[PDB]
Amino acid sequence: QGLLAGKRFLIAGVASKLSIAYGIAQALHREGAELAFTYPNEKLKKRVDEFAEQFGSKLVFPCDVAVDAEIDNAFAELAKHWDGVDGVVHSIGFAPAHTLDGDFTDVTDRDGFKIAHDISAYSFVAMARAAKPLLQARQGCLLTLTYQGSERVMPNYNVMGMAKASLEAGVRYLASSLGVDGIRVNAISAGPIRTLAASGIKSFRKMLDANEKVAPLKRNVTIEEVGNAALFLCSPWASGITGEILYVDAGFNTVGMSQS
Amino acid sequence: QGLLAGKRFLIAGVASKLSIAYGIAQALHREGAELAFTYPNEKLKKRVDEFAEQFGSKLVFPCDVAVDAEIDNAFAELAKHWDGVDGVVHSIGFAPAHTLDGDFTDVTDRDGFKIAHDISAYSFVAMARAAKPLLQARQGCLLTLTYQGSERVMPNYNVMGMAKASLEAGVRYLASSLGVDGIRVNAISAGPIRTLAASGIKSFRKMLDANEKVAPLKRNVTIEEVGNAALFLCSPWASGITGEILYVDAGFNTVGMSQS
Amino acid sequence: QGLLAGKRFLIAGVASKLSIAYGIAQALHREGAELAFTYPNEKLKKRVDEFAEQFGSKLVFPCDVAVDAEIDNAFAELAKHWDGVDGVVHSIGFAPAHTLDGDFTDVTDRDGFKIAHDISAYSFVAMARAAKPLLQARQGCLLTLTYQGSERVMPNYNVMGMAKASLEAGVRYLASSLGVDGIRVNAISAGPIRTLAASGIKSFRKMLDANEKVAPLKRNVTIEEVGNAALFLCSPWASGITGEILYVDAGFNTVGMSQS
Amino acid sequence: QGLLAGKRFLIAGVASKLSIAYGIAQALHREGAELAFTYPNEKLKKRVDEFAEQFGSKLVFPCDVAVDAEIDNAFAELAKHWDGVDGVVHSIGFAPAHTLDGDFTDVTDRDGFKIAHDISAYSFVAMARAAKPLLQARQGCLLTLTYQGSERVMPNYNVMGMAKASLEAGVRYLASSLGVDGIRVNAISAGPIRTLAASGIKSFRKMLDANEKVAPLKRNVTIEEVGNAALFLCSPWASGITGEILYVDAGFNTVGMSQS
Numbered sequence A, B, C, D: 001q002g003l004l005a006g007k008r009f010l011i012a013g014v015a016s017k018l019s020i021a022y023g024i025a026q027a028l029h030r031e032g033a034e035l036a037f038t039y040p041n042e043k044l045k046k047r048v049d050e051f052a053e054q055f056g057s058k059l060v061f062p063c064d065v066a067v068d069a070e071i072d073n074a075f076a077e078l079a080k081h082w083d084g085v086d087g088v089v090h091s092i093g094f095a096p097a098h099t100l101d102g103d104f105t106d107v108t109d110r111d112g113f114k115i116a117h118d119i120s121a122y123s124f125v126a127m128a129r130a131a132k133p134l135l136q137a138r139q140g141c142l143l144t145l146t147y148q149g150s151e152r153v154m155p156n157y158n159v160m161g162m163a164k165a166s167l168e169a170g171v172r173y174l175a176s177s178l179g180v181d182g183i184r185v186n187a188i189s190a191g192p193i194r195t196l197a198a199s200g201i202k203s204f205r206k207m208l209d210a211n212e213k214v215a216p217l218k219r220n221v222t223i224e225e226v227g228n229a230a231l232f233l234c235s236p237w238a239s240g241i242t243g244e245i246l247y248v249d250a251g252f253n254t255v256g257m258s259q260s
């Protein structure tokens, strides 16, 4: 009997033991929650199934967030097993690699933009709708993951900046739409973390190294720190908070410039 | 020969005389600039031609921002007459009227979101890339229009809130991208004005009357006021300003509660 | 042994059982913390002693933040009992009442401004330096209470808006200065609550009712909700978070307009 | 007869030909306005009278913003010459040197704090009250100067950051309080400039270089640039704009991170 005794949570975005989603799952499971998981396609099925069982779960559903059908069907199959749901965690973002490698103006094509926004922003709004029924049942909550490249420029984060800003406004629109029904909607803006969200990003070590120098606490956050703040936002302790973008960046966003 | 004597400006978005883009035109012509215009579709070629003739210009090109060829071609066409441009003004925004009516979570479907972001946000980035060689020659600037539904929730502004939030990040990324070449990128966040943008929005009237009671100046703003602001941002007086969102909203954004 | 087992917290500003500081005390004690308290003057000493007693504590001191020596003092006294502290909660805001009633420009006078800024903002900074040696010894945190009247205008909040804004900048400055030493500094920005901070405030009822209509959750926040949040920011669950203003306002801050 | 033909402006803060207020005075004179000036004390009377003569003006009054009488008297004295004023420009800020040098927590004492907020923030509210009759006659505007150190930590900027935060809040409360009289109140947030405000700030040059490398335009701003920005905000072209903070920093504020 810990903080989330008897509570249920769907977790979209486990790719690896390094995912932010995995730090969240683990913090939620630590506190007594029962877990469900999506996987984007066949190739990942077996690795996700595997992670689910590590959490006492065998509730593992196909969900590619590009396909309208895949979304509703995943929430449908989940209705069979679950009465309701205490939260939906969205840890999904993606842009074609090329849009994230170079000058913003040169490399930002229309398809790269469509994919960035569709997978990284619209999808949260879609999952939310597909999940409304199951969330009204328990007055659960939604959480997504954003990045402060929405507010301030980072080199090569590019169209993902625009997509996250879209996400953030989404959070607010959802919180206003769903609050009436007692559904809370929040986000965590996490500092950079070495996950498979770094693969193919040439600058990544040097980004991480700058963060470590600039941030008030002089260190980079972990998936355990993002997890624990996710846990809080997913728990009755966060009952007075909706439409919030909670920064978990060891204070980086607060610095206008560091000792050089 | 006033503030913009012998400077060249292209204006995407005049549709009627209510348009913010017309307000901007009037203001830029008034201070001695040479103008050029685009139109979205045939239906409109006619009235835009007139308006351009009204502004002592015959540089009018087709530009539906949905089509990459058309963006590329309007800028390939323009460079025949001008070997440098002093600013491009982006005053285009659109989402399907169904996504602007009712509950955010219920109405915001994939194609609806896709269109909003594509026309309202991507288009400005694409227009920036096309105007780059033309802009680079005179160190002109870019300007776009936004609305504060990006930052806080308005009823029924819905997905446009997201698209505007995307747009505003675009302003910032373009600014950092294009900055080394001395191209400045700015936007105006204007208060609500009754224009063709108001059409099909049942709530608009009462929406406008709330603004009147809340704004510090106790009145709505006009396309003149927005035009004069845009003129400033396109003038040598704005030379130390880029990446800025300028609020022309009678101070509405600054008020949390008004005598109720 | 719950979440704050074996941790120690000094709470400044419990004045009655409606207080913000009270819901915080109660939240930290519940989770195992041992508590210490200040009182502002002789006339409150008894109820605070009572309240400390309530929460298993005999650690209770005088501290008027107008007077440096009483700040140096109260921490010197505390060192006698504690060799290190896991956090100091500052829940203290005052302005002479005539500054909080009527027109901002008419009523904001030099002494009124001084006082508001002295007690409400400088005091967090004074307490921080005095607590530095003791916080350093356990890598504890700091927490203050702010209100959104800093960011957006509210009717007679007036010079307290200037105070809280100065305070919030305080939080950021403190965060960078104390982060190298592992000390996290945060704020909670609470929605409005009827407490002794309402007690003189002519339009308080009207605001509480407006707030409730505008908030996406359609209710006011409680001291239990602000308490649970302070607890979070005061716990190892918030290790990755510093310089943050957390909004526990039921989403109020995110609403531009609500059905009229 | 330019844009401000036969308008009147009081300018508070001219110290040298390096001063922001000096760059402001030059821009408003350039475009036709008649000017008046305040000097802080006797040592300055000489140089201020000289500059006043440069921009063709006799109207020169003493004004130490620490002292209530001299504010009141300077505006009393002004009223004898002018029957209305079109705007008042407040380019004043001061903290004792010791607060601006080293660790924030260590160096920020009560008296340094009070002085910071009193000359930097209060002074504006005070000047606004006394200028009210004069501003009401002509529906004139106010303008102050701020620095982004309010929103994000600069090293050594320290208490001036708290005071600029408070000043910015004042801008918004003033705008709400005076809007009803058609009085606009705005600020410019300038990027750093070498002026007398850089005296004894040993870090200053390294700061200016950091600004140059990070800013999208890759250069620092000038008093001519802040001057023109101020001109615009003091002009009929800004009639739709109140309670605004206009950044004139070459986009510095929009960058989260620059190439290492």
Ligand SMILES: NC(=O)c1ccc[n+]([C@@H]2O[C@H](COP(=O)([O-])OP(=O)(O)OC[C@H]3O[C@@H](n4cnc5c(N)ncnc54)[C@H](O)[C@@H]3O)[C@@H](O)[C@H]2O)c1
Binding pocket: A013, A014, A015, A016, A018, A019, A020, A021, A039, A040, A063, A064, A065, A066, A091, A092, A093, A094, A119, A145, A146, A147, A189, A190, A191, A192, A193, A194, A195, A196, A197, A198
């Ligand atoms: N790693 C960081 O530095 C960092 C910091 C802040 C925020 N974020 C954000 O947090 C979230 C989590 O990323 P992460 O660091 O855990 O990396 P990750 O790559 O492990 O997680 C991203 C997930 O999105 C999934 N995904 C991609 N396309 C999909 C589709 N079409 N349908 C369904 N799922 C799809 C991937 O399978 C993957 O599981 C992302 O939104 C990311 O942008 C990351």
Ligand SMILES: NC(=O)c1ccc[n+]([C@@H]2O[C@H](COP(=O)([O-])OP(=O)(O)OC[C@H]3O[C@@H](n4cnc5c(N)ncnc54)[C@H](O)[C@@H]3O)[C@@H](O)[C@H]2O)c1
Binding pocket: B012, B013, B014, B015, B016, B018, B019, B020, B021, B039, B040, B063, B064, B065, B066, B091, B092, B093, B094, B119, B145, B146, B147, B189, B190, B191, B192, B193, B194, B195, B196, B197, B198
């Ligand atoms: N009217 C307001 O209340 C208000 C306030 C602030 C900002 N804005 C923004 O200002 C901008 C202009 O709006 P307005 O009030 O002047 O209304 P408007 O309807 O007069 O102008 C909108 C323009 O965008 C053009 N457009 C639409 N789809 C297009 C496409 N596919 N290709 C090319 N062009 C296309 C339209 O033809 C029209 O010229 C929009 O971006 C809007 O979001 C409007």
Ligand SMILES: NC(=O)c1ccc[n+]([C@@H]2O[C@H](COP(=O)([O-])OP(=O)(O)OC[C@H]3O[C@@H](n4cnc5c(N)ncnc54)[C@H](O)[C@@H]3O)[C@@H](O)[C@H]2O)c1
Binding pocket: C012, C013, C014, C015, C016, C018, C019, C020, C021, C039, C040, C063, C064, C065, C066, C091, C092, C093, C094, C119, C145, C146, C147, C189, C190, C191, C192, C193, C194, C195, C196, C197, C198
């Ligand atoms: N109540 C609300 O609506 C609300 C909302 C957001 C933030 N806040 C803030 O939270 C804090 C706590 O207020 P509250 O609502 O619990 O009311 P409260 O009156 O119970 O607490 C305010 C405390 O300030 C103390 N205080 C005043 N002058 C002092 C001095 N010179 N020295 C030492 N202590 C002094 C009082 O004793 C009191 O304990 C304040 O900073 C307030 O601005 C209040």
Ligand SMILES: NC(=O)c1ccc[n+]([C@@H]2O[C@H](COP(=O)([O-])OP(=O)(O)OC[C@H]3O[C@@H](n4cnc5c(N)ncnc54)[C@H](O)[C@@H]3O)[C@@H](O)[C@H]2O)c1
Binding pocket: D012, D013, D014, D015, D016, D018, D019, D020, D021, D039, D040, D063, D064, D065, D066, D091, D092, D093, D094, D119, D145, D146, D147, D189, D190, D191, D192, D193, D194, D195, D196, D197, D198
């Ligand atoms: N220089 C920069 O880097 C920079 C950048 C952004 C904003 N600012 C702000 O712009 C404003 C103008 O400063 P500046 O940089 O031109 O430097 P400056 O030193 O020339 O101007 C400061 C003025 O304030 C006056 N002053 C100080 N105490 C006073 C008092 N008690 N009563 C009356 N007047 C008093 C000084 O005599 C001087 O005229 C300041 O508020 C400053 O904070 C400066």
Ligand SMILES: Cc1c(CN(C)C(=O)CCc2cnc3c(c2)CCC(=O)N3)oc2ccccc12
Binding pocket: A093, A094, A095, A096, A097, A100, A147, A154, A155, A156, A157, A158, A160, A192, A193, A196, A197, A198, A199, A200, A201, A207
């Ligand atoms: C930080 C940071 C991140 C981490 N982060 C916050 C992210 O949001 C990750 C975003 C991301 C989205 N799509 C893809 C990839 C990364 C990598 C490979 C791929 O094919 N698609 O990504 C960056 C990309 C460029 C610059 C900085 C960053």
Ligand SMILES: Cc1c(CN(C)C(=O)CCc2cnc3c(c2)CCC(=O)N3)oc2ccccc12
Binding pocket: B093, B094, B095, B096, B097, B100, B147, B154, B155, B156, B157, B158, B160, B192, B196, B197, B198, B199, B200, B201, B207
């Ligand atoms: C204010 C305001 C506006 C004006 N504004 C700032 C806008 O950005 C306009 C947006 C808009 C985008 N697409 C369409 C329409 C309007 C009308 C009809 C149509 O078919 N498509 O629109 C609102 C919509 C709902 C609520 C408020 C507003």
Ligand SMILES: Cc1c(CN(C)C(=O)CCc2cnc3c(c2)CCC(=O)N3)oc2ccccc12
Binding pocket: C093, C094, C095, C096, C097, C100, C147, C154, C155, C156, C157, C160, C192, C193, C196, C197, C198, C199, C200, C201, C207
């Ligand atoms: C909400 C709200 C509050 C609560 N709040 C957030 C506060 O910060 C309270 C501030 C406060 C500061 N000083 C005094 C008082 C209240 C009451 C009586 C007194 O003598 N001095 O105060 C308001 C004051 C005016 C308008 C709204 C509010």
Ligand SMILES: Cc1c(CN(C)C(=O)CCc2cnc3c(c2)CCC(=O)N3)oc2ccccc12
Binding pocket: D093, D094, D095, D096, D097, D100, D147, D154, D155, D156, D157, D158, D160, D192, D193, D196, D197, D198, D199, D200, D201, D207
């Ligand atoms: C930039 C920058 C400035 C310029 N700026 C934005 C300012 O607002 C100036 C502030 C200031 C206020 N008071 C005093 C001084 C400067 C200098 C000497 C003195 O005796 N008093 O000041 C800094 C101070 C420390 C760090 C950076 C900066």
